Point group: D3
Chain length 29, copies 6
């Protein structure tokens, strides 16, 4: 397993935070 | 928009932090 | 827990329709 | 597009609610 | 379940890959 | 961006496919 799945969601969480980030950038420009 | 888009993906990402957190807890228990 | 997991993904699916709605408007305007 | 994109996130929202409902099943029995 | 979960996540992964595809197409367009 | 968003979703698809594959292992065992 379950630790692998947990870290999979943690990595997906970083990826979605970065997606929100880059969407803030594209929202401005 | 796109600012609402960014903030809602931010919320979704924080929900994956919660998800990961939950799987760590159930991983041993 | 097991209830909590289904608890967040209910709201998560709740949000994806908001994403749909938003890009629905962006596609038009 | 963007119409397909918004349509696809609507489908994703439909998938996730079933996913949650599915963990609801395992939460009981 | 758990088979439904596995196939469901595989399907949503395929859908996200498809969306990545249209965003790659629209990046140049 | 748009390319970064597409590659983010491509990574999302890869991790979700891995998760889907993984849950099948728990399903058998």
């Amino acid at each position: 397993x379950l630790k692998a799945i947990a870290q999979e969601f943690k990595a997906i969480a970083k990826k979605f935070k970065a997606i929100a980030f880059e969407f803030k950038a594209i929202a401005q420009k």
